[PDB]
Amino acid sequence: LKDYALEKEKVKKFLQEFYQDDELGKKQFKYGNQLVRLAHREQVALYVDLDDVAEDDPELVDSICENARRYAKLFADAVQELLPQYKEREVVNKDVLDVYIEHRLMMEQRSRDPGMVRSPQNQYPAELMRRFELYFQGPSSNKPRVIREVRADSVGKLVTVRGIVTRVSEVKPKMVVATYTCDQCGAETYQPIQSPTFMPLIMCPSQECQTNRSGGRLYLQTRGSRFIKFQEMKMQEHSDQVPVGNIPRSITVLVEGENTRIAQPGDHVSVTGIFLPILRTGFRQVVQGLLSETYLEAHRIVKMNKSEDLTREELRQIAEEDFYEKLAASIAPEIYGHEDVKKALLLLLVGGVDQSPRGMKIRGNINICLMGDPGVAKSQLLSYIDRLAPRSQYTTGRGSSGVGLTAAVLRDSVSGELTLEGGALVLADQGVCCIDEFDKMAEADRTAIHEVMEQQTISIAKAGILTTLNARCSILAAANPQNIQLPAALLSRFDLLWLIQDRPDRDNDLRLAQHITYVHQHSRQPPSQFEPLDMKLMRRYIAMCREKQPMVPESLADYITAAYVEMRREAWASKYTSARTLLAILRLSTALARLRMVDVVEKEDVNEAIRLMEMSKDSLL
Amino acid sequence: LVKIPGIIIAASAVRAKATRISIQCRSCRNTLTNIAMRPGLEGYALPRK
Amino acid sequence: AGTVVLDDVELREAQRDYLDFLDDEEDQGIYQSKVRELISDNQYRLIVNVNDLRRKNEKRANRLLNNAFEELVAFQRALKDFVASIDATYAKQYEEFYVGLEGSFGSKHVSPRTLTSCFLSCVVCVEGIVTKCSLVRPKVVRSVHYCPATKKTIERRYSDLTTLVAFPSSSVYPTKDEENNPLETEYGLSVYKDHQTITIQEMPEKAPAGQLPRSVDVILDDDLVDKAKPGDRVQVVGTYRCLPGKKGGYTSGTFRTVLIACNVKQMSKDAQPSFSAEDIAKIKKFSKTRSKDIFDQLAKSLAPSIHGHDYVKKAILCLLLGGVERDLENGSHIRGDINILLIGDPSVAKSQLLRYVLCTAPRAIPTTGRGSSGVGLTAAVTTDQETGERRLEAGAMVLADRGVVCIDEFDKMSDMDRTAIHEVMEQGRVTIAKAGIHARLNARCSVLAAANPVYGRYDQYKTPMENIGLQDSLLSRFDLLFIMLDQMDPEQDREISDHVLRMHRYRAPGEQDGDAMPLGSAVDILATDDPNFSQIYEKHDNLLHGTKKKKEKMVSAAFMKKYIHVAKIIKPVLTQESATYIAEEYSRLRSQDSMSSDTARTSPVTARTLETLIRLATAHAKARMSKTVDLQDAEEAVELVQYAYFKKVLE
DNA sequence: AAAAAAAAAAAAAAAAAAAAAAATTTTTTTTTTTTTTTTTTTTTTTT
Ligand SMILES: Nc1ncnc2c1ncn2[C@@H]1O[C@H](COP(=O)(O)OP(=O)(O)O)[C@@H](O)[C@H]1O
Ligand SMILES: Nc1ncnc2c1ncn2[C@@H]1O[C@H](COP(=O)(O)OP(=O)(O)O)[C@@H](O)[C@H]1O
Numbered sequence A: 001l002k003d004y005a006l007e008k009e010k011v012k013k014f015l016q017e018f019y020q021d022d023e024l025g026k027k028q029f030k031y032g033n034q035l036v037r038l039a040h041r042e043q044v045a046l047y048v049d050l051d052d053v054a055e056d057d058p059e060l061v062d063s064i065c066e067n068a069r070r071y072a073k074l075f076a077d078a079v080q081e082l083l084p085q086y087k088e089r090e091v092v093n094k095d096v097l098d099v100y101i102e103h104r105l106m107m108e109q110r111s112r113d114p115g116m117v118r119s120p121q122n123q124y125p126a127e128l129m130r131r132f133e134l135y136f137q138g139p140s141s142n143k144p145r146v147i148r149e150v151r152a153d154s155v156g157k158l159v160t161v162r163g164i165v166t167r168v169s170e171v172k173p174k175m176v177v178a179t180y181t182c183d184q185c186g187a188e189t190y191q192p193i194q195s196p197t198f199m200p201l202i203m204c205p206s207q208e209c210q211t212n213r214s215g216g217r218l219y220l221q222t223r224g225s226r227f228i229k230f231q232e233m234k235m236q237e238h239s240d241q242v243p244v245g246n247i248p249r250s251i252t253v254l255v256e257g258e259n260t261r262i263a264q265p266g267d268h269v270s271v272t273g274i275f276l277p278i279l280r281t282g283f284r285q286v287v288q289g290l291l292s293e294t295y296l297e298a299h300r301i302v303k304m305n306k307s308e309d310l311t312r313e314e315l316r317q318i319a320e321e322d323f324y325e326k327l328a329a330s331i332a333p334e335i336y337g338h339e340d341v342k343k344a345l346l347l348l349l350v351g352g353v354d355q356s357p358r359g360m361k362i363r364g365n366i367n368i369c370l371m372g373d374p375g376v377a378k379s380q381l382l383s384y385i386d387r388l389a390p391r392s393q394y395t396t397g398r399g400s401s402g403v404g405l406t407a408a409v410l411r412d413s414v415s416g417e418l419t420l421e422g423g424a425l426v427l428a429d430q431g432v433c434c435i436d437e438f439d440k441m442a443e444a445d446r447t448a449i450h451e452v453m454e455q456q457t458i459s460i461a462k463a464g465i466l467t468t469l470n471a472r473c474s475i476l477a478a479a480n481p482q483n484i485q486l487p488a489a490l491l492s493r494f495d496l497l498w499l500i501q502d503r504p505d506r507d508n509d510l511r512l513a514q515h516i517t518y519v520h521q522h523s524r525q526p527p528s529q530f531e532p533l534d535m536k537l538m539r540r541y542i543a544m545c546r547e548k549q550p551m552v553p554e555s556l557a558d559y560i561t562a563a564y565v566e567m568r569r570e571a572w573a574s575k576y577t578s579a580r581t582l583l584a585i586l587r588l589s590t591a592l593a594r595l596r597m598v599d600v601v602e603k604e605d606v607n608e609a610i611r612l613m614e615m616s617k618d619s620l621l
Numbered sequence B: 001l002v003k004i005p006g007i008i009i010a011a012s013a014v015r016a017k018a019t020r021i022s023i024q025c026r027s028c029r030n031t032l033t034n035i036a037m038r039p040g041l042e043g044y045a046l047p048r049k
Numbered sequence C: 001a002g003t004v005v006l007d008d009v010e011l012r013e014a015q016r017d018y019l020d021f022l023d024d025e026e027d028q029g030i031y032q033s034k035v036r037e038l039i040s041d042n043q044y045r046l047i048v049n050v051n052d053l054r055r056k057n058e059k060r061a062n063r064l065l066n067n068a069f070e071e072l073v074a075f076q077r078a079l080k081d082f083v084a085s086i087d088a089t090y091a092k093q094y095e096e097f098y099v100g101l102e103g104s105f106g107s108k109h110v111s112p113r114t115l116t117s118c119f120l121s122c123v124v125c126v127e128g129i130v131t132k133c134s135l136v137r138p139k140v141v142r143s144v145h146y147c148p149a150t151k152k153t154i155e156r157r158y159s160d161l162t163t164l165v166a167f168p169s170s171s172v173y174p175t176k177d178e179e180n181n182p183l184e185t186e187y188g189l190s191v192y193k194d195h196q197t198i199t200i201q202e203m204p205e206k207a208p209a210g211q212l213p214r215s216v217d218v219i220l221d222d223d224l225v226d227k228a229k230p231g232d233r234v235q236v237v238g239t240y241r242c243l244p245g246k247k248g249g250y251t252s253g254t255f256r257t258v259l260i261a262c263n264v265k266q267m268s269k270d271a272q273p274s275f276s277a278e279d280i281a282k283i284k285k286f287s288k289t290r291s292k293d294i295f296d297q298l299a300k301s302l303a304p305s306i307h308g309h310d311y312v313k314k315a316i317l318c319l320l321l322g323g324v325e326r327d328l329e330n331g332s333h334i335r336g337d338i339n340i341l342l343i344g345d346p347s348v349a350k351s352q353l354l355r356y357v358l359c360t361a362p363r364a365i366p367t368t369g370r371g372s373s374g375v376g377l378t379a380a381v382t383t384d385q386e387t388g389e390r391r392l393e394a395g396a397m398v399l400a401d402r403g404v405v406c407i408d409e410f411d412k413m414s415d416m417d418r419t420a421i422h423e424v425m426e427q428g429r430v431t432i433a434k435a436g437i438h439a440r441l442n443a444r445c446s447v448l449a450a451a452n453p454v455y456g457r458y459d460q461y462k463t464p465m466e467n468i469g470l471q472d473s474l475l476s477r478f479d480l481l482f483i484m485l486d487q488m489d490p491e492q493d494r495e496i497s498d499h500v501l502r503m504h505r506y507r508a509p510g511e512q513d514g515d516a517m518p519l520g521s522a523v524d525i526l527a528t529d530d531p532n533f534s535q536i537y538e539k540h541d542n543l544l545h546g547t548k549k550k551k552e553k554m555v556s557a558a559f560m561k562k563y564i565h566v567a568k569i570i571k572p573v574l575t576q577e578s579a580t581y582i583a584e585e586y587s588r589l590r591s592q593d594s595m596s597s598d599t600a601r602t603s604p605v606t607a608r609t610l611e612t613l614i615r616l617a618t619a620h621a622k623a624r625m626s627k628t629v630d631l632q633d634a635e636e637a638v639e640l641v642q643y644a645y646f647k648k649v650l651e
Numbered sequence D: 001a002a003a004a005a006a007a008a009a010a011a012a013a014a015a016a017a018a019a020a021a022a023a024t025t026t027t028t029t030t031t032t033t034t035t036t037t038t039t040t041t042t043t044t045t046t047t
């Protein structure tokens, strides 16, 4: 056993006398400055890094990792005790709960009588007067665990897991301390809520009412109470860590306070928290014993590995004029050839600028459909784009169909209500939806995709659901074969319809075979003049481009009009082109300008857009 | 004792029913072993002393 | 305090006998070695063979079988004492060492139907299929509380009164001190035990036809909770007992029964094979002495009962050995699984080859064209109906992950199902999703399909494209496509008939006396041990009626299984010479001018053709135990693909 | 020094207060299981 007063002193010592050179090499009191901030009420969440703690006290780290809840409370109490001596001015009462705390403290001081001893229950609860919250950051030496392996043997421990977020409730107020006011005396009563349910009190235990022996019925109310942002999410194992034949395992994660609104369904996250049980009374327990649920209380949520939330080297790399080609060649380096296809995919990943001229939106998303023979790496390209893009949903033929693409309605648990859960399109709302086997996809699904392309929304008027969803995603379809199957339905919608025909050819086939065989030899593409960018770098560059909206100067108006009219004449003479093609020109040029990271598009961007468009068009022939 | 012809349309699973039960006192932990149970769909009231 | 036994003669005798049995040092230390192995592996559950227990002391075996709880407690005490004697620190680390049972249960081996109330408080080994499972919940076995007001630290213990009389006193969780001081539980210090409840249903192929199935509820605890998932053909050895009802006042005399599992086992076919020193030495000897023709020997010894089809047999061996997956740093994946499609004339033993693969290859799932329809074939998304949450059900492909799916009547299979499995055939994964859930299940299975050509029988005078109604998109992902023709050559008919008649005239030595009918009727199966979860091996099959004679032996089935299992783990690396040879051969193959006239391609040539070339070379390397893909391996791969991809159009 | 009267001692019976002892199943709820139904969706057939 351990003396928790000594432990509190240890954590106080650490929190006060820990320093680091984080701030531009200058030595800083990492936690002292944060304590000052949240004593001024400028910060709410205090993330104690257990690596920092272990830097000088490994045993404290082990004790925390073994009984995290106890030491979580110890750290919170130490912070609360230290705040007054770190406060350096009066807070501006930014919150009504701050007003309540001010009034409570002032009245306690007014009726202090310092020498008198008040009963243990005649005092404000700790949680009622915190206005802050202390979380951990798991020590790096703790290997992340598998949701399947997180079992009863590690209840109350601090563990970190990684997985895909499947279901996430909304943020709703969870009572933490229920405040009641009496109708006789005029005191207050505080019930700290710990169980999932509580029975509201009826009789006021205040001293005045106890002396009067009066009724003292008290009224529960939300004004003086203490709520906390609450959320409940389902976190799913990663495909690579599931056993041979099993299905991925889920875990329930309860998120509170400032950890809320971090993760959203579809995100790849790492969550560090304490594995805690919930008592399971109420049911007709078949087997005797105190059985309980299990959940992870979220202390640190970190989006990772697909949607993580500069340097002179990268600035120079951007300044390079061949940065466009560098990124293109970096898109799926293993895939040999398909240079223009990969450039189009990069333009897809970047996207054009959204327009809102006088009450109608011309979305900047780029829609690409890869028609091709078997074995031309369309599936590989779509899978790579899924792994690369931040919000990417890769939907095959019919496994994710109907409500697998559109939202449905499911009963809730926190509220028992009917909540609207998004499908693949909504999960990729503002990213990339890689549709595979688009030709073989169902008719209702195809119509939904057409509607999302034309409007970025999904209207539903079925029985249990009646809503107008929002899915501002870019469609990357991969169909197979007017050649032999070239629907005008696809032509009229897809901004870039690419045909990938692989005619046999000794030289090209031999080069591709050498590429493939080296790939199988060394688990990597053959070395080239330019090393391909790592996915993190590609995502960073693309994201920086995304917020670089370039405009179209009026000088290029006549050039664009001439190119469009020339293409119209060529199409009319030959054996499809329209305003959709013109808008494809505009948004491809805008995306090229954005890639170059300028504010104004140029004739070079327009020419490249036209070149890619003509390559796609003559791929048909 | 009656004799009846018919055709069976259902047959529940073979559950377990008690012919003889034993009971124990929570306080003194003394037993009342081998209490006969009436055969058939007939229940049994526990003693209250 | 309370009553404490001093001289329990039966308990003392049971402990003495169990410790004597577990000593085993003079009895070739079988259980001594098992205890040492579990100590090293950091396990606290000893699995004991009831047959060995009965051989040592039939009295103890009968007492244990007929009195489960008492004898199991005595056995666990003896095991804990033995573990302390061998190593005290480990014994102190683990509070209770459990004992599960295994072996041949004469009468106790039953099914959920035959499991009647006559087996209460006995050890029963019940077979079945897990119809459902429950979430693994922790039950507190020792709670720790801290009182801030007094700084005291108390610890309450709860006993395992699952099938014992339980009172409110034992199951009250302290929430105040004797002076009404609120407590706070130390979750980290507290001790919890994982607990799960599953349902075992009688196997449909074993249940009486036309009747509803019989189920049983099973309780799993620490170290057995996640030993099974829905759809698992499991053998649960446990203690059958009546679950206490809630404190009443009036009782109907009805008692829910349950099986407290003491051991859970899956189908032993998928279990890790036992490789003894002599077995591994024999494998080494085989691989080293014979490497040049080892692949051919294995291919010809694969299915003795099916004559001919040498190339198809070699392709099936390559499929069994598999390739090697490529896990690129950037996440791109390349499957190492060979897909084979046998199409051709009726009565060419294609279904027999598929059945042989089903019987031999581990994790082999049978399937029929219309037997599985979409959601049944791939994974499916349903709802719990009690929680309102989505749930995933594994399909045939998912269950066959890291295995084989043997599909028959592939042509009869609806186009929708083939389109659905397209992804599995190449990416080896199932991508399903509904509104409340989305997953990407792993289905890394090789597809071995059989089909009948359009018009029922193959048309020698029509193109293979027209004979096979499968379009190029589906044909390409099939690594090999073999057309098995029922040629009417008199000599081939002679050979086939001779082989068939010899196989028919064979009788098993010893078991068959010349007139026996081996079929049993629904009783002997339970009477004798199941040959599906059961526990010296030669190398070359002794000469028998299967073949007449020659200077070439046939590989034993068990030896071949062990050799294939060992060789599948090998990941031979592609050499530069083989890489160049394969690249040039792929270029030539894709260039149509290489192949002669009057020759039509069975399936189109593609990057996937190159990939299957590489995979076949890798499989040949695995067969050779080479660890490097060599020129001979590349030659065999190119030979096989060249034979498979072209068929001469007769006229 | 002995007898007669007085008083005390021992012993037994009765009463009052206070602590102890004895007696004490029915009624309602509600959870689970089973079945029913409405709509969506998927498959099959026909032109
Ligand atoms: N251009 C290419 N470069 C490298 N590999 C390729 C190429 N085309 C096809 N492949 C390989 O062939 C296999 C089939 O490709 P896939 O993505 O299924 O094509 P499709 O999209 O036409 O089905 C994959 O394993 C892939 O690695
Ligand atoms: N080459 C062969 N050698 C031995 N038996 C054969 C051969 N070809 C066909 N048969 C016999 O034909 C029977 C049925 O063949 P089957 O597996 O149904 O083929 P299919 O699936 O084409 O009908 C089997 O019992 C098998 O013994």
Ligand SMILES: [Mg+2]
Pocket: A378, A379, A436, A437, A478
């Ligand atoms: Mg594809």
Ligand SMILES: [Mg+2]
Pocket: C350, C351, C408, C450
């Ligand atoms: Mg057949």
Ligand SMILES: [Zn+2]
Pocket: A182, A183, A184, A185, A186, A187, A204, A205, A206, A208, A209, A216
């Ligand atoms: Zn009051």
Ligand SMILES: [Zn+2]
Pocket: B025, B026, B027, B028, B029, B030
């Ligand atoms: Zn009693």
